[PDB]
Structure formats: C-alpha cells, structure tokens
Design a protein around this ligand. Structure first.
Ligand SMILES: Cc1cc(CN)n(C)n1
Length: 330
C-alpha cells in the first residue's frame, strides 16, 4: 500500500502545517499537525472541555461504528513550548491520503492547553517519531506509521513541506519527481525516540562552509530552526541591526532587511535555506522588528531541524530495521 496527502500551512508565516486525516466510520475528517518530533495521535473531541474548544473540528467517537474505548488507557503529553494535552483513548480506523490503518490508537483530548485552544486551525497532532515516545498508559501505543509500515510498499514516509504553499506527505514510496539531484542518506539514532541525526556543518549566505558536527532532530512539528548559539550568532551577525531580544524571546531583525541564506550539511551534500524562509514577520502587528527563523537551541537541550530547515528539502524518513534519514534539494 501507499498513501499521499497534501499538507497546507495554517497561516501566512508557515507557523505549522495541517494535513487532512479520516478517522472513524463514517469518516470524520480532522486537520492534524503531522509531527515527526512526537509519537501521539491525539485529537480535539466530543470529550474536550467545552471552554477549551474554539473553532476546532472535533472527533466524536460515539458517532463512529468502528470506535472502541481502549479500556483504562490514558495519555498526557507536554511539548517543548510548554503546551500540553491529555485524555483517554479509542482505537478506530484512521486513513491518510488513501492509506488505511485499522485499530489505530486515537487519543481523545479531555484537556488541552491555551495555545491549542487558541489555534482554531489545528484539530490535533499525528505523531511520526518513534513509538517509544508514545505517552499512552498503561499500555504504550504505536504511531500511525508504525502500524502502517508492514503494509507499505516500502517502510518509509516523506515530508515535502512548501514555503508559503502546500506540500505533501507520502507514505510507502519515494516520489522521484518531487526532488532534484539525488537523495543523501544519513545515520539516525533512535535512542531518544527522535529522528536524530548529525549535520556535517553550515554556511551563512555566500560564506565558506564550516565543517562541524551538529546533532539534532528532524522535527516537522517545530516551526523554526534551533541551532547552537555559536552558529546562530554567526548567522545573525550578517544581518544589520539583528539582535537577540530577551523580551521578545529570540533574535529579531529589522523588517527592512534582506536575509542571507543558510546552508546545512547532510553528509557531503548541502541543503540551502533561502533567506526569505528565515523571515517570520513583525514581532507584533505593525512592528518593524521581525522575528528570526533561526534561533538558539541553548535553552532547549537539543538542536531542532524544524520546518524552516525541512521545507528547503525533500526529506525521507526511512523506517527500515535500521532507520535513516534522506535529504534532497528540490
Ligand atoms: C502546534 C504544535 C505542534 C507542537 C509539537 N511540537 N506543539 C507544541 N504545538
């Protein structure tokens, strides 16, 4: 089998991407944030505290003939930005872009934190990290990918995120028309449950490439590119007026600037992030201070190749017995 689904930015800044997912019988279509940095498929639901739902589409398990309560199972997750959600668990049929999994754990939110409530465009998350991170208790559950993979033509999925435009998640095949040149594969560590890999270095704009190992995760569920403070300082030093603002919470730069590109290494290959990808617009409406798309990971504990980096590439998440990541230009 295979699946193919379009993923769409939720706003003009590509703050996140939503992908339609069919849940239940008859189908209930929810727009989920495919997140290669977490491993829970959870949804706004008929069980979500009413005051915490504001415009989201909800899953109603009582209306699905294939929904079964997973007796005794609960879940609770906290994310890197301090947001969170928790609830109970059903199994049900879940389909993504024509690819169907039966008995998928669908984690029904009873509570969500304010940032989820405040985002009317995201109906839940679909985790695509390794199932060892899944938070369901007392019986940990598998991701959609983990459940689908035996059935897939090839045990892979690919992320092809657009810049200010729709893109594609494919399951089970590599679309050789979707990238240029060749795909460079690189080793993955699953020890932390992430698609963790080691970049071979970076360049700023037309600058010389710095060979240096940067260990980080490929995370479609994180908006920005978070890298060591040395790297991030070298980038923003090339932007007149750029500075790190403690009050804003990161690097800001004059909205009048033209940003340099940022290159990262994948083995001997190079992925170039155009400067425009690094502009996340005014810090507040009407401000001429703009928020940077490359930020320090110093306060995080891990480097994160988020959407800013991934959207510059065609990315293969290879879930073979020894997982690897592939990157191609596009
Ligand atoms: C919308 C969204 C996605 C995620 C997962 N990194 N969070 C914390 N919020």
């Amino acid at each position: 089998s295979t699946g193919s689904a379009t993923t769409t930015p939720i706003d003009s800044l590509d703050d996140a991407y939503i992908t339609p997912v069919q849940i239940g019988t008859p189908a209930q279509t929810l727009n989920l944030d495919f997140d290669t940095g977490s491993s829970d498929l959870w949804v706004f639901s008929s069980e979500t505290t009413a005051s915490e739902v504001d415009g989201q589409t909800i899953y109603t398990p009582s209306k699905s003939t294939t929904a079964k309560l997973l007796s005794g199972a609960t879940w609770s997750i906290s994310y890197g930005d301090g947001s969170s959600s928790s609830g109970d668990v059903y199994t049900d049929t879940v389909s993504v872009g024509g690819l169907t999994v039966t008995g998928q754990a669908v984690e029904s939110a009873k509570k969500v934190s304010s940032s989820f409530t405040e985002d009317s465009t995201i109906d839940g998350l679909l985790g695509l990290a390794f199932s060892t991170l899944n938070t369901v208790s007392p019986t940990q559950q598998k991701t959609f990918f983990d459940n689908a993979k035996a059935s897939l033509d090839s045990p892979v999925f690919t992320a092809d995120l657009g810049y200010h435009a729709p893109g594609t998640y494919n399951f089970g095949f590599i679309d050789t028309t979707a990238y240029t040149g060749s795909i460079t594969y690189t080793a993955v560590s699953t020890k932390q449950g992430f698609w963790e890999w080691t970049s071979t270095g970076y360049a700023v704009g037309s600058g010389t490439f710095k060979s240096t190992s940067i260990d980080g995760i490929a995370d479609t569920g994180t908006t920005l590119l978070y890298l060591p403070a040395t790297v991030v300082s070298a980038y923003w030093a090339q932007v007149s007026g750029a500075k790190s603002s403690s009050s804003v919470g990161g690097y800001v730069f004059p909205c009048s600037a033209t940003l340099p590109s940022f290159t990262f290494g994948v083995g001997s290959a190079r992925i170039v992030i155009p400067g425009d990808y690094i502009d996340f617009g005014p810090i507040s409406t009407g401000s001429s201070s703009c928020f940077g798309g490359i930020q320090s990971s110093a306060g995080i504990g891990i480097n994160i190749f988020g959407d800013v980096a991934l959207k510059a590439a065609f990315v293969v998440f290879n879930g073979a017995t020894t997982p690897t990541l592939g990157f191609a230009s596009k």
